[PDB]
Every structure is written in structure tokens, then in C-alpha cells.
């Protein structure tokens, strides 16, 4: 024996991309852990299956998952597909670790062995608000939102960190999504003297209260979560998104630890940037510091909730439910080019 993990990705749609990523992240941490031994001299064996991210499909994988022997689930990658594998899953004892699915109610069923290794859009407003007290430290705050539910949670929980932290913020605001106009919006940062805003919400109206928010003269410094890092941002704001600061997920890529797997990823002419290859990797090192515990699926996920994993994405930790703890995003000071660089 060998340890069969069965990594579920989209090698096939429009999603291939994100399959390519966790293929990519999942055979490389396997080569590095087994090439140093394995666990315990037991080599790990990736086999692989296919989703196409269609919820139908993804029950189907699972129903091979099980009848196939296999008792650790690497993935599952789109929210849809996750869900209702995540089911079957459970009902067997079959432990499931995603790498990229984001929905809040995987984890919102009582179940036991979903574990994740991604980072959730919620964990943005506290990596917003803690910038903003420590690093910012801004004089009047204005908070703007489209009242979509994304961005309405997110200025909400900037909005929170924002008052524990005693920041004054001068105004909670909404915003129509598909306003084109916002001269009423410019005008009260004028007057109210905002000089920061935080804006929950997506890149359209972004790249619209910018270009219009520079064009008044307004000086104020902008902050949106990454549903405004979007090539289209740039296409259409330009210069007026010079210095905005986004929050988005850290370049584990670029951290001088991870180097020798960049090295190595890049030698086999694969792309090593890509966010489900750290997240794949460090979903695959969480496994093995369970496996070494404990072969028993309900016995690593008990492990791995009341520990913490070194991973390369940084000391990993998760609650009873299964979600990261006290994850964090990367603030990235954007550019004029659709480029952003490390926030100081």
C-alpha cells in the first residue's frame, strides 16, 4: 500500500483553468512529500477525476469516489459542485478538503469532515479594517456600498472593525448598481472632507467614482475588495486608479519560502502563480501531517481543527466548522496598467 487521494477538479470547461491550477498544486506537493518519504515510507498516489463543475457530475464523481475505496477528497473547486458531493461525502466518512469553493454554507451544516483551504469573502473586512486602523490610519471615513449583498456584507464588516478601532466614519452610504452618475456621491465626499473611502462592491461603478472622483479634484484615497480587481477596471479608469488599495489573496508564489516549489513547478513548464496551487499544496500538506496521525478520516479532521498546519500559505488553523481562522488577504497598491504591488 500506497495512500490514494482523489483530487476533483474541471480539466474540461471554461473552469479548466482553475482544475490546471489544483492538478498543478496537488502533483507537486505529492512529488515533495513522498520524494522525503512518504508517511511513514507510504507514498501518496493522486487519482484524479473530473467535475466539469456541473452538480450532477460532481455526485457522479463522488458515487466513484466511494465505490473506488478512496477515503480522502482533495478539492472539490466550484461552489455548486461541492455542495452536494460534500453530502455523500459525509454519509460515507470520507473527509473532504476544498481548495477553492468560497460558499458560506458548506461550512453552515454541522458537518464534520469539510475542511477548507481558502480563505472566504467575508475574511476581506477585517483584512480591510485592520489595514485601514494600522497602517492607514485615515481622519474621516466615508463607507460606500451597492447594497448588492457581496459588497453590502463587506462594507458592513469594514463598517464594524472600523467602530471597535474607534475610527471616525463620518458615512455609511448606498449606491444603485448601475449608476453611471454619481456627481451626488462626489459632492458629499467633497463637503464631508472624506480623504478615505472603503467601497464594497464590483469594479463598473468602481472605475465610474473614480474617474469622476478625480476629475472633481477630490484627493481621497480609495479601498475595494477584489471584486474591483478586474483588467476592466484598469481598461476604463486608467490613472484614476493609480494608488487605489485593493484586497485580494497573497502571492504565496513570491514568498521567499515557497521558492524551491516555483523553481520546481516552472521547470516543468507549468504555471506557478495561480491561487488553487498554493491553496491545493497546502490542502495536500494538511492531509499529510493528518495522515501521520491517524489513517481514520473522522480522527485527521479532529486533528487538524484542534492543531495548527505549517503550510505554504503560512500557519494553518481551522474552527469547528471547518473554516480557516484568522485568515487573511493581501492589500496590493494598484496601478494605472491593471499591475498592483505589495501594500507597504
Same mark, same amino acid.
Given at each position: 500500500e500506497d495512500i490514494k487521494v482523489a483530487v476533483v477538479?474541471?480539466?474540461?470547461?471554461?473552469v479548466a483553468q482553475y482544475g490546471d491550477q489544483e492538478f498543478t498544486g496537488a502533483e507537486q506537493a505529492v512529488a515533495d512529500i513522498n520524494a522525503k518519504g512518504g508517511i511513514k515510507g507510504n507514498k501518496l498516489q493522486i487519482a484524479k477525476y473530473d467535475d466539469a463543475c456541473d452538480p450532477k457530475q460532481a455526485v457522479a464523481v463522488a458515487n466513484k469516489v466511494v465505490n473506488d475505496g478512496i477515503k480522502y477528497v482533495i478539492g472539490h473547486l466550484c461552489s455548486s459542485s461541492t455542495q452536494p458531493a460534500s453530502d455523500i461525502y459525509e454519509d460515507e466518512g470520507i473527509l473532504m478538503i476544498t481548495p477553492?469553493?468560497?460558499?458560506p454554507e458548506l461550512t453552515a451544516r454541522?458537518?464534520?469532515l469539510i475542511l477548507r483551504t481558502t480563505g472566504l469573502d467575508s475574511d476581506q473586512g477585517p483584512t480591510a479594517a485592520k489595514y485601514i486602523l494600522?497602517?492607514?490610519?485615515?481622519?474621516r471615513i466615508a463607507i460606500v456600498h451597492d447594497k448588492q449583498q457581496y459588497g453590502e456584507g463587506l462594507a458592513r464588516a469594514v463598517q464594524d472593525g472600523l467602530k471597535k478601532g474607534? /475610527? &471616525? #466614519?463620518v458615512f455609511f452610504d448606498g449606491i444603485?448598481?448601475?449608476?453611471?452618475?454619481f456627481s451626488t456621491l462626489v459632492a458629499r465626499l467633497k463637503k464631508e472632507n472624506i480623504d478615505f473611502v472603503y467601497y464594497g462592491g464590483y469594479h463598473p461603478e468602481m472605475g465610474q467614482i473614480l474617474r469622476q472622483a478625480r476629475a472633481a479634484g477630490l484627493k481621497t484615497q480609495f479601498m475595494g475588495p477584489e471584486?474591483? /480587481? &478586474? #483588467?476592466s477596471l484598469s481598461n476604463i479608469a486608467g490613472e484614476s486608479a493609480e494608488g487605489l488599495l485593493v484586497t485580494k489573496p497573497k502571492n504565496?508564489?513570491?514568498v521567499p519560502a515557497n521558492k524551491p516549489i516555483v523553481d520546481a513547478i516552472k521547470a516543468k513548464?507549468?504555471?506557478?502563480?495561480?491561487?488553487f496551487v498554493w491553496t491545493t499544496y497546502a490542502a495536500l500538506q494538511s492531509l499529510q501531517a493528518g495522515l501521520n496521525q491517524s489513517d481514520d478520516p473522522a480522527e485527521i479532521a479532529k486533528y487538524l481543527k484542534a492543531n495548527s498546519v505549517d503550510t505554504v500559505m503560512g500557519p494553518l488553523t481551522w474552527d469547528e466548522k471547518g473554516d480557516l481562522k484568522g485568515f487573511e488577504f493581501g492589500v496590493f497598491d494598484w496601478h494605472a496598467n491593471g499591475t498592483a504591488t505589495d501594500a507597504k
Open positions: 477538479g474541471a480539466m474540461s470547461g471554461p477553492a469553493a468560497t460558499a454541522g458537518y464534520q494600522e497602517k492607514v490610519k485615515p481622519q474607534n /475610527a &471616525n #466614519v444603485t448598481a448601475g449608476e453611471k452618475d471584486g474591483v /480587481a &478586474n #483588467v504565496y508564489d513570491q513548464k507549468q504555471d506557478p502563480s495561480g491561487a
